[PDB]
Amino acid sequence: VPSWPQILGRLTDNRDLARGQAAWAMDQIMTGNARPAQIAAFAVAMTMKAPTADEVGELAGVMLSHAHPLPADTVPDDAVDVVGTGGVNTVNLSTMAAIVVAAAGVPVVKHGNRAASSLSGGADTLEALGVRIDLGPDLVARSLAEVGIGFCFAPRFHPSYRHAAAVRREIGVPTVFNLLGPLTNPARPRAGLIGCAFADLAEVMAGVFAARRSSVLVVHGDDGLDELTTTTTSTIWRVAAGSVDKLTFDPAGFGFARAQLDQLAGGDAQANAAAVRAVLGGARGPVRDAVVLNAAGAIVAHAGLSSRAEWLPAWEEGLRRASAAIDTGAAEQLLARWVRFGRQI
Amino acid sequence: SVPSWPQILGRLTDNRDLARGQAAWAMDQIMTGNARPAQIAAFAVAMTMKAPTADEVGELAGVMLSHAHPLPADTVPDDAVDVVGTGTVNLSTMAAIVVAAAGVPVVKHGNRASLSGGADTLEALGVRIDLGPDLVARSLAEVGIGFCFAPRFHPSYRHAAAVRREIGVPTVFNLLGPLTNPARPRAGLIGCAFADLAEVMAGVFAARRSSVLVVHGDDGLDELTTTTTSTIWRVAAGSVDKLTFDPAGFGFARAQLDQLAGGDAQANAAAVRAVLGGARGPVRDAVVLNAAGAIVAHAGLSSRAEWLPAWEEGLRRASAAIDTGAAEQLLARWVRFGRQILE
Ligand SMILES: Nc1ccccc1C(=O)O
Ligand SMILES: Nc1ccccc1C(=O)O
């Protein structure tokens, strides 16, 4: 017999939930039946108990059951996502990597929205580049077919999440809800590079992806970055065929020099947009290096769907393809093509 | 740094104690109607799971007090006591009557609760529970006991009270009742269901230089009973001894938890009338125990007496108060006072 006092009581007593309790709670939230106080109490208690992968899979699965889908046969089977869950943040890096990956010929389907103020959301940077971010499912699918990239604006695909999003804005603090973005991409891409700023939650997310039919790299810079970093090593949870392979990754093995931490963080939408134009135009430096690193990681994830190429040669190839997509102008050109698509309605 | 919800909640979710003043800021937001329900709830839960400190709880209680209606000046005897728990047959209500009848002024504080609460049981007995400060003061003066109805004394708490009801689960706010009695008694017997929080409560009383016994049944009750041993934090002179308490040491037989079972207001009123009329059994025993503890706390405002003799005198005084008829007579005087208000 599920109820808020029961579920909240179990969480505050530091107990993992019974199977189905997280699903019940999410469905109450998603149907407009949870009070703001109940939504907040749940988010916080779940965060402080430390969610399990089973629990997170329930939350994400319920949320997806309420989302608008893309139309039948419209997402390529091998589409990928490239995104972090936030720190500071790296929307600068994930935005540029996504364009690079798509320019390398891998279909990309991203998901997000506008942030409340000045630390750019994913959507805001694209909007500052002239990309049209709020498109219906049919137009997102056209974008994928004609441009090789699409963007699913969270408020349009997840209308029933509005009660949770309001509570999240009111309380400010990061919660378990911050983890759901990468896991509730309404295009349901089966591969991805997914960054997490916290190693304990990264393992949890990897667990959720492992229970899906997915080929993903969940990544955590050992400096706290929610992307593969160039300032030090990163932890990677490699997910494929329902299993996880956790490893320490060092980009110095591919000849990347060490950068400093104040060189990579994203800023506001305009600052991100300027940085995007510089990198896609060929400006060398630590930002480009991190973009190429994370783009290659997405490409490696994508390869995991079919290739069965081994880890090291897959990396060598993802790096060569990412670098080439920039240096040959393919990424600059793809961004311009994406902007053109939007202007043509 | 300017306090904010993101900052405060983030510190709590990182399992960190707050900076001085952060808890105070949160309560003031709450008390002024400036905190949204979601922020109140997030704070209540986060503080609970982190485990509040005495300093933090003192901040919450002090701000809450600052918004409360006071009793009029010089109307509360310097040596008043409270008898109360933080959350089953209203033992604390019977014990309050016995303590008052033993000559110790008592001021209780609470609210209406299917399980009848203290306040609901007093109304079933004919006591007028919702009186303003001037009349609570007069009751204290003329009867030796008073009751502060929480919604009337803490009107600004209504935003928090609604959130509490919405989420259901116990939180740090459950500690506040004993620490925000608007009559500000300096002594008390205070029951708490949870050992860690009982110790936190003791610390706040210690910081106030109160003379209190904070009691924890080793079987999860927020009262003393004859069911089990209990843990007691003896607070006096800003200092704290933690002690084990076993009622078998004073001759009490061990009772079963279900012989103390409460019911509706009418049933609980009958139980009060039976104890005050001198009926023997485990209810009487539990009442005598809690009243004795309150009396011991009261004694602690002047002297620091030997523990065991304090308890013997406390127990004798509580027993006498029943068996002389003084407790039954005090309830009658209390009812009478309330009935005189109309004219
Ligand atoms: N504000 C949001 C943020 C993310 C996902 C959905 C929403 C929504 O309002 O439906
Ligand atoms: N339940 C309460 C306790 C104290 C103050 C106000 C309220 C209220 O309900 O408005």
From Swiss-Prot, chain B:
Binding site for 5-phospho-alpha-D-ribose 1-diphosphate: G85, T88, N90, L91, S92, T93, K108, H109, G110, N111, R112, A113, S114, G118
Binding-site residues for anthranilate 2, renumbered to this chain: R164
Residues given in the record as Mg(2+) 1 binding sites: S92, E223
List of residues binding anthranilate 1: G85, N111
Record-annotated disulphide pairs: none
Residues annotated as binding Mg(2+) 2: D222, E223
Top-level class of the enzyme under EC nomenclature: transferase
Keywords for the protein's UniProt record, in alphabetical order: Amino-acid biosynthesis, Aromatic amino acid biosynthesis, Glycosyltransferase, Magnesium, Metal-binding, Transferase, Tryptophan biosynthesis
InterPro entries (UniProt xref): Anthranilate_Pribosyl_Tfrase, Glycosyl_Trfase_fam3, Glycosyl_Trfase_fam3_N_dom, Glycosyl_Trfase_fam3_N_dom_sf, Nuc_phospho_transferase
BP-aspect Gene Ontology terms: L-tryptophan biosynthetic process
Listed cofactors: Mg(2+)
One GO molecular-function entry: magnesium ion binding
Free-text comment on the cofactor: Binds 2 magnesium ions per monomer.
Functional pathway: Amino-acid biosynthesis; L-tryptophan biosynthesis; L-tryptophan from chorismate: step 2/5
EC number: 2.4.2.18
Swiss-Prot/TrEMBL catalytic activity: N-(5-phospho-beta-D-ribosyl)anthranilate + diphosphate = 5-phospho-alpha-D-ribose 1-diphosphate + anthranilate
GO cellular component annotations of the record: cytosol
Oligomeric and partner information: Homodimer.
Family: Belongs to the anthranilate phosphoribosyltransferase family.
Function text: Catalyzes the transfer of the phosphoribosyl group of 5-phosphorylribose-1-pyrophosphate (PRPP) to anthranilate to yield N-(5'-phosphoribosyl)-anthranilate (PRA).
Protein name, as recorded: Anthranilate phosphoribosyltransferase
Organism, as annotated: Mycobacterium tuberculosis (strain CDC 1551 / Oshkosh)
Lineage of origin: Bacteria, Bacillati, Actinomycetota, Actinomycetes, Mycobacteriales
Name of the gene this protein is made from: trpD
